[PDB]
Design a protein around this nucleic acid. Structure first.
Ligand SMILES: [Mg+2]
Ligand SMILES: [Mg+2]
Ligand SMILES: [Mg+2]
Ligand SMILES: [Mg+2]
Ligand SMILES: [Mg+2]
Ligand SMILES: [Mg+2]
Ligand SMILES: [Mg+2]
Ligand SMILES: [Mg+2]
Ligand SMILES: [Mg+2]
Ligand SMILES: [Mg+2]
Ligand SMILES: [Mg+2]
Ligand SMILES: [Mg+2]
Ligand SMILES: [Mg+2]
Ligand SMILES: [Mg+2]
Ligand SMILES: [Mg+2]
Ligand SMILES: [Mg+2]
Ligand SMILES: [Mg+2]
Ligand SMILES: [Mg+2]
Ligand SMILES: [Mg+2]
Ligand SMILES: [Mg+2]
Ligand SMILES: [Mg+2]
Ligand SMILES: [Mg+2]
Ligand SMILES: [Mg+2]
Ligand SMILES: [Mg+2]
Ligand SMILES: [Mg+2]
Ligand SMILES: [Mg+2]
Ligand SMILES: [Mg+2]
Ligand SMILES: [Mg+2]
Ligand SMILES: [Mg+2]
Ligand SMILES: [Mg+2]
Ligand SMILES: [Mg+2]
Ligand SMILES: [Mg+2]
Ligand SMILES: [Mg+2]
Ligand SMILES: [Mg+2]
Ligand SMILES: [Mg+2]
Ligand SMILES: [Mg+2]
Ligand SMILES: [Mg+2]
Ligand SMILES: [Mg+2]
Ligand SMILES: [Mg+2]
Ligand SMILES: [Mg+2]
Ligand SMILES: [Mg+2]
Ligand SMILES: [Mg+2]
Ligand SMILES: [Mg+2]
Ligand SMILES: [Mg+2]
Ligand SMILES: [Mg+2]
Ligand SMILES: [Mg+2]
Ligand SMILES: [Mg+2]
Ligand SMILES: [Mg+2]
Ligand SMILES: [Mg+2]
Ligand SMILES: [Mg+2]
Ligand SMILES: [Mg+2]
Ligand SMILES: [Mg+2]
Ligand SMILES: [Mg+2]
Ligand SMILES: [Mg+2]
Ligand SMILES: [Mg+2]
Ligand SMILES: [Mg+2]
Ligand SMILES: [Mg+2]
Ligand SMILES: [Mg+2]
Ligand SMILES: [Mg+2]
Ligand SMILES: [Mg+2]
Ligand SMILES: [Mg+2]
Ligand SMILES: [Mg+2]
Ligand SMILES: [Mg+2]
Ligand SMILES: [Mg+2]
Ligand SMILES: [Mg+2]
Ligand SMILES: [Mg+2]
Ligand SMILES: [Mg+2]
Ligand SMILES: [Mg+2]
Ligand SMILES: [Mg+2]
Ligand SMILES: [Mg+2]
Ligand SMILES: [Mg+2]
Ligand SMILES: [Mg+2]
Ligand SMILES: [Mg+2]
Ligand SMILES: [Mg+2]
Ligand SMILES: [Mg+2]
Ligand SMILES: [Mg+2]
Ligand SMILES: [Mg+2]
Ligand SMILES: [Mg+2]
Ligand SMILES: [Mg+2]
Ligand SMILES: [Mg+2]
Ligand SMILES: [Mg+2]
Ligand SMILES: [Mg+2]
Ligand SMILES: [Mg+2]
Ligand SMILES: [Mg+2]
Ligand SMILES: [Mg+2]
Ligand SMILES: [Mg+2]
Lengths: 98, 115, 127, 206, 101, 79, 151
RNA sequence: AAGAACCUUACCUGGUCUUGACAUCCACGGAAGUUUUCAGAGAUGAGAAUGUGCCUUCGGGAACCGUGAGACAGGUGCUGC
RNA sequence: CCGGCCGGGAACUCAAAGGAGACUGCCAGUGAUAAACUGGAGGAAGGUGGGGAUGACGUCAAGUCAUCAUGGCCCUUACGACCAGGGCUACACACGUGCUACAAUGGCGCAUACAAAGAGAAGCGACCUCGCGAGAGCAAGCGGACCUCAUAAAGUGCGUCGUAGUCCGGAUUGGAGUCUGCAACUCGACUCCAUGAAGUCGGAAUCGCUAGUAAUCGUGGAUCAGAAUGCCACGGUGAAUAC
């Protein structure tokens, strides 16, 4: 089957990464469910903005870790080899799982 | 209503009656009545004399009242004779369990004084 | 056949199905009497079924999760008013004028930076 | 001092992140330190080569550095010899491989870092802070700017008390989030002290 | 934040990875409720002090990598609260925009 | 109080006491280990605990056993 | 508000006695946002009131609330310079609400046993005007009646 | 200070070190390391075994270690007027 | 076998994206033929719909040289540097900011229902078994919409105490421990047992708050071996009042 899961920081860099990985699989050797979204992880940080005193004043930051799934339901020979050695898409982590 | 050294309550539940004994509290009193075979919901007015005598032998197992008071007095007096940090703490009249002594400590130190 | 309305008052999210039959109101496999006990108002769910009468007309199979008591009870009220669309605009003329279909967005305000809880500021020392 | 960093407020909207890579929570901290180690080293080495910003990416254990610069000839040198010298030394401290790419900038007067470093360089050679500042303000408006605020904080000209002075020419809307604004700062270490040089350059409305 | 304080911290990191990231068996495995509870457990805590005072990962303060500030640390970034701010709104931490919800 | 896995004394103080006891009574032992407990074998010795600026002699008695050495060495002086 | 003329929020009817008058009374009695504990007490009070009085609940609560209702209350304005007692005719929305406070405020004191007992006894005394809440209205009148010289 | 039992720790006591814990060099001797013993509060000092590699201008290497030498390294010392 | 367990299903909750949407845009009236504005429809939402981020020129020679950078001026067998302890936790007193109280809308027991937002690989650590309990073993699973910390507590429902310094408060002391950690006495946290202080709503003063806001009950995270009543977030019930 191969459950492909991939995550990234930018919401609109992962979209073309999820689109291209599906198209280089769907077209070349059939079968795909789709871009299953999953919930976004929002790790927040509340640092003190000043170097000395002024506890009241702070800045708040976050890092949206956008997950995505693919989910194919047949171990095709054209598709399985297209996943390896043919990903690219920088700033987008990907983890294939059998 | 006359067990141990003192214990003379009335119109009070058996569990709460034995809290008035020095050396017996809430959970200890439940262990007394559990071993004695008496319900906690009843009171001493409702109980008979045949049941009170079993409570006397049950509290005799645990150290209570004048036995306990001397055991505590010995342990505090021991510490002061050693001249340890706790002994100096005790006799000086200041808190023992590594507490703040600057702002608070009014329980141990006593009420406020002039400067 | 089987009409539907959502409702999601304050985090909580109701899921009201409605069919023409018995007067009973099922909810999470529990009865309405035992699920919502003494709290404030059981009959907030039955408020929308007054201008449009229930009695023994419409049976309600409901499912809800999120929030607490009134969050769920208020979400069921909105869910029923949304669900009552089988007679489209004839019911909503009288129903809207008594509130009801208004979502009533108001969610809990976040804790502000510096302040002790949303609006509660700490104290004041002027010497 | 009470103004938000103009680059930072627009990092999701208009401006991009320079360090563009994903990392799991374990590696993230060490990956960010090695990112700073090359950036600090590469800026100080390529001083005369005139670098504006350094973009870094890390696709599957391969550090692709990108050097945006005004003078691409000085970075590469002769027959790309200095690229290979950079490739080796950057690769050692960072993490295994390297892939240095050089992007030219034909309009160097519109980049905020290059204007700030130019004003800094002028202040260090005993040029009048006004003759350095206003000339830089004048230079890039003729080329293709619509804003160009330039602040210079510090001692300036061997004064006793420090003063802050600025000269702008046009629309520099710091509050507008859709507005693209090149902001950058640089310190000028003179004999008298430090002199800060903040520069804002409003290029486009979107 | 003092080059000596930064340089004494490199001993703490290097010397900890040597001993106790390997020789935790001395405390963990030996000092246990089993047949070694008699003299073997005594010899463990006896020999555990023969080691240097450093090596224990508890003695690592965990300070910022750029400056060396002890307080204001964040384990995600490996930086002080000041240097993370300076680096965040600039373009160095990936994805770290200003939060507002 | 802590520590069920053997009452704790520093290797050096254990060996210094064992060497002192087998030979015989002599003089106050200069020791900085306050953290260390007091064994039964330490009774009789007048070991000198470091209060911070100086060494305070402590004649160990039958009661001073479960307690630690720093308890018999007040650090902060007052009035 | 300085020039911000906006109305008020709508309230809700109480399930067992679906109306409005006593729905507000629950809210003024409520401490720490516990409407569950408060609404049980008001039902317990009005059921014990209706048993003794031999009336319903709404009309029992009315013949009680009107007996502790202020007709006129006292403000004091400084128009010109000096500060003197100016009585004013209270508004009909506040009129019955100011009464509901005085019943509950009296019931905080007068430690009988339970809250349901105390409110029942206060409203019982209000029906035969001889409680603390009627005395607080009585004193409010005495100010307006004595200081009637100021318009 | 988004957390002081040692650490942190900038303070105090006593012990201690002066190219120093951290750096590049001019160059003297060694792979680096690892196991393990003694005196000492510990810093330290004294050892005892083993191992003796990536290139040969092979009087050398590229690292690492420990000496003597100075360019010096180092300061949470003062000055936010 | 009767638990979303099951095939399976793609409606709905949700999760994400990408779009619709509120535009004084329609409607009358006051206005000056204007900007406006009073309401009224329609609408999930109504006049910047709620909240956040956003902080003009400049003020206080405001704070920071101890985060970092930094011009001078200073120290160099020392104000530099390594170590064992001790100290930052001292205590006639005074204030600040909290928290827990002084109870009966409450206290303690048994029957049991409803959240969100997080967080986890020298990690978070099930279920089992040993524990009176902190915890101790075995160890399942999870770099997670799945696995885990994790039963939310208020709240119901029954019971019992009946206004007492109380079955209120839960301080303080003694004893017995627990985990972490080389090490817990100065100086940790928590547990058990006994103990049961002040306090019965607070002098002059005075603080915050205009709706899911105050009020009250849980809950999480960051720093962190361990050590919150702080801080930063989260969601329950849910007011009064604004002439
Ligand atoms: Mg402030
Ligand atoms: Mg303040
Ligand atoms: Mg108890
Ligand atoms: Mg108990
Ligand atoms: Mg305590
Ligand atoms: Mg103390
Ligand atoms: Mg939502
Ligand atoms: Mg309407
Ligand atoms: Mg605000
Ligand atoms: Mg809240
Ligand atoms: Mg203040
Ligand atoms: Mg004051
Ligand atoms: Mg004041
Ligand atoms: Mg004042
Ligand atoms: Mg300034
Ligand atoms: Mg600001
Ligand atoms: Mg420095
Ligand atoms: Mg630590
Ligand atoms: Mg003295
Ligand atoms: Mg020290
Ligand atoms: Mg000294
Ligand atoms: Mg210097
Ligand atoms: Mg310095
Ligand atoms: Mg000094
Ligand atoms: Mg200043
Ligand atoms: Mg300044
Ligand atoms: Mg100052
Ligand atoms: Mg118009
Ligand atoms: Mg218009
Ligand atoms: Mg019109
Ligand atoms: Mg007109
Ligand atoms: Mg007109
Ligand atoms: Mg017109
Ligand atoms: Mg008009
Ligand atoms: Mg108009
Ligand atoms: Mg309208
Ligand atoms: Mg309107
Ligand atoms: Mg508008
Ligand atoms: Mg708008
Ligand atoms: Mg707004
Ligand atoms: Mg608008
Ligand atoms: Mg808007
Ligand atoms: Mg604005
Ligand atoms: Mg000043
Ligand atoms: Mg000042
Ligand atoms: Mg200030
Ligand atoms: Mg400095
Ligand atoms: Mg200088
Ligand atoms: Mg000079
Ligand atoms: Mg001079
Ligand atoms: Mg001096
Ligand atoms: Mg302090
Ligand atoms: Mg403490
Ligand atoms: Mg005196
Ligand atoms: Mg006071
Ligand atoms: Mg109690
Ligand atoms: Mg309580
Ligand atoms: Mg998670
Ligand atoms: Mg579980
Ligand atoms: Mg179990
Ligand atoms: Mg127990
Ligand atoms: Mg253990
Ligand atoms: Mg376990
Ligand atoms: Mg899995
Ligand atoms: Mg499972
Ligand atoms: Mg937890
Ligand atoms: Mg469970
Ligand atoms: Mg549990
Ligand atoms: Mg369970
Ligand atoms: Mg309860
Ligand atoms: Mg008493
Ligand atoms: Mg008293
Ligand atoms: Mg207690
Ligand atoms: Mg008592
Ligand atoms: Mg009382
Ligand atoms: Mg009060
Ligand atoms: Mg109160
Ligand atoms: Mg006031
Ligand atoms: Mg005020
Ligand atoms: Mg307001
Ligand atoms: Mg409570
Ligand atoms: Mg709690
Ligand atoms: Mg909490
Ligand atoms: Mg945590
Ligand atoms: Mg808390
Ligand atoms: Mg709290």
């Amino acid at each position: 089957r191969i459950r492909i899961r991939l995550k990234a920081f930018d919401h609109r860099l992962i979209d073309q990464a999820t689109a291209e990985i599906v198209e280089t699989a769907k077209r070349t050797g059939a079968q795909v469910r789709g871009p299953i979204p999953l919930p976004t992880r929002k790790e927040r940080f509340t640092v003190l903005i000043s170097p000395h005193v002024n506890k009241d004043a702070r800045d708040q930051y976050e890092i949206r870790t956008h997950l995505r799934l693919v989910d194919i339901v047949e171990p095709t020979e054209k598709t399985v080899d297209a996943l390896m050695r043919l990903d690219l898409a920088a700033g987008v982590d990907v983890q294939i799982s059998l | 209503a006359r067990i141990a050294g003192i214990n003379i309550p009335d119109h009070k539940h058996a569990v709460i009656a034995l809290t008035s004994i020095y050396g017996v509290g809430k959970t200890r009193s439940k262990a007394i009545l559990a071993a004695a075979g008496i319900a906690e919901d009843v009171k001493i007015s409702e109980l008979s004399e045949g049941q009170i005598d079993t409570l006397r032998d049950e509290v005799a197992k645990f150290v209570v009242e004048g036995d306990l008071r001397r055991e505590i007095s010995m342990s505090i007096k021991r510490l002061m004779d050693l001249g340890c940090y706790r002994g100096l703490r005790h006799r000086r009249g200041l808190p023992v369990r590594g507490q703040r002594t600057k702002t608070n400590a009014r329980t141990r130190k006593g009420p406020r004084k002039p400067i | 056949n089987q009409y539907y309305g959502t409702g999601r008052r304050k985090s909580s999210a109701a899921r009201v199905f409605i069919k023409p039959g018995n007067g009973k109101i099922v909810i999470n496999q529990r009865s309405l009497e035992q699920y919502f006990g003494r709290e404030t108002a059981r009959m907030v769910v039955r408020q929308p079924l007054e201008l449009v009468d229930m009695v023994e007309k419409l049976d309600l199979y409901i499912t809800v999760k999120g929030g607490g008591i009134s969050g769920q009870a208020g979400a069921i009220r909105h869910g029923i008013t949304r669900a009552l669309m089988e007679y489209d605009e004839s019911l909503r003329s009288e129903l809207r004028k008594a509130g009801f279909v208004t979502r009533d967005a108001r969610q809990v305000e976040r804790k502000k930076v510096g302040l002790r809880k949303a609006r509660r500021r700490p104290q004041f020392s002027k010497r | 001092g009470q103004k938000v960093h103009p680059n930072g407020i627009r990092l999701g909207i208009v401006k991009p992140w320079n360090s563009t890579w994903f990392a799991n929570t374990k590696e993230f901290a060490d990956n960010l330190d090695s990112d700073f180690k090359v950036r600090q080293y590469l800026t100080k080495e390529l001083a005369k080569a005139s670098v504006s910003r350094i973009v870094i990416e890390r696709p599957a254990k391969s550090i692709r550095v990108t050097i945006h610069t005004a003078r691409p000839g000085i970075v590469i040198g002769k027959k790309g010899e200095d690229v290979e010298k950079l490739r080796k030394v950057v690769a050692d401290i960072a993490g295994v491989p390297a892939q240095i790419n050089i992007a030219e900038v034909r309009k160097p007067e519109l980049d905020a870092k290059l204007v700030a470093d130019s004003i800094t360089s002028q202040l260090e050679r005993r040029v009048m802070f006004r003759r350095a500042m206003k000339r830089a303000v004048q230079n890039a408006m003729r080329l293709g700017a619509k804003g160009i605020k330039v602040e210079v904080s510090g001692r300036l000209g061997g004064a006793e008390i420090a003063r802050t002075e600025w000269y702008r020419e046009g629309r520099v809307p710091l509050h507008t989030l859709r507005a693209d604004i090149d902001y950058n700062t640089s310190e000028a270490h003179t004999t008298y002290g430090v002199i800060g040089v903040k520069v804002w350059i409003f290029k486009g409305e979107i | 934040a003092k080059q000596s304080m930064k340089a004494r911290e490199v001993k703490r990191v290097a010397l900890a990875d040597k001993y106790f990231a390997k020789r935790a068996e001395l405390k963990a495995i030996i000092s246990d409720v089993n047949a070694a509870s008699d003299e073997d457990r005594w010899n463990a805590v006896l020999k555990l002090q023969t080691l240097p005072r450093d090596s224990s990962p508890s003695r690592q303060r965990n300070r910022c990598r750029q400056t060396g500030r002890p307080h204001g640390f964040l384990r995600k970034f490996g930086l002080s609260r000041i240097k993370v701010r300076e680096a965040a709104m600039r373009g160095e931490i990936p994805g770290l925009k200003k939060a507002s919800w | 109080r802590s520590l069920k896995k053997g009452p704790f004394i520093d290797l050096h103080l254990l060996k210094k006491v064992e060497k002192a006891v087998e030979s015989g009574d002599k003089k106050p032992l200069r020791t900085w280990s306050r953290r260390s407990t007091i064994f039964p074998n330490m009774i009789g010795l007048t070991i000198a605990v470091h209060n911070g600026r100086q060494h305070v002699p402590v004649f160990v008695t039958d009661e001073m056993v479960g307690h630690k050495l720093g308890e018999f060495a007040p650090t902060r002086t007052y009035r | 508000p300085r020039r911000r003329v906006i109305g008020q929020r709508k309230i809700l009817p109480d399930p067992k006695f679906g109306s409005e008058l006593l729905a507000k009374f629950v809210n003024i009695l409520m401490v720490d946002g516990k409407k569950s504990t408060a609404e049980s007490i008001v039902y317990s009070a009005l059921e014990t009131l209706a048993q003794r009085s031999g009336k319903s609940e709404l009309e029992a609560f009315e013949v009680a609330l009107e007996n502790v209702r202020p007709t006129v209350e006292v403000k004091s304005r400084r128009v010109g310079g000096s500060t003197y007692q100016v009585p004013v005719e209270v508004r009909p929305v506040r009129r019955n609400a100011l009464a509901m406070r005085w019943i509950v405020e009296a019931a905080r004191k007068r430690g009988d046993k339970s809250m349901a007992l105390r409110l029942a006894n206060e409203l019982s005394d209000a029906a035969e005007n001889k409680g603390t809440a009627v005395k607080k209205r009585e004193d409010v009148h005495r100010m307006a009646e004595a200081n009637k010289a100021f318009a």
